Amino acid sequence: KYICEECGIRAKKPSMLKKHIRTHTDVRPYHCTYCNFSFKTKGNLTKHMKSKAHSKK
Ligand SMILES: [Zn+2]
Ligand SMILES: [Zn+2]
Structure with a gap:
């Protein structure tokens, strides 16, 4: 699975999501x-x- 539960970004690829989810940090x-x-x-x-x-x- 790779769909940000917050923004709803769709990134079937990890690197793409893995990075996106890490952006909600600092x-x-x-x-x-x-x-x-x-x-x-x-x-x-x-x-x-x-x-x-x-x-x-
Ligand atoms: Zn997000
Ligand atoms: Zn400003």
């Missing part, structure tokens, strides 16, 4: 330069910065 080095939230990938980062939240670049 393995997110990508921390926003303002909030206290973080992500496991740099992609989501840009997604959180592109928003008009707080990025007076």
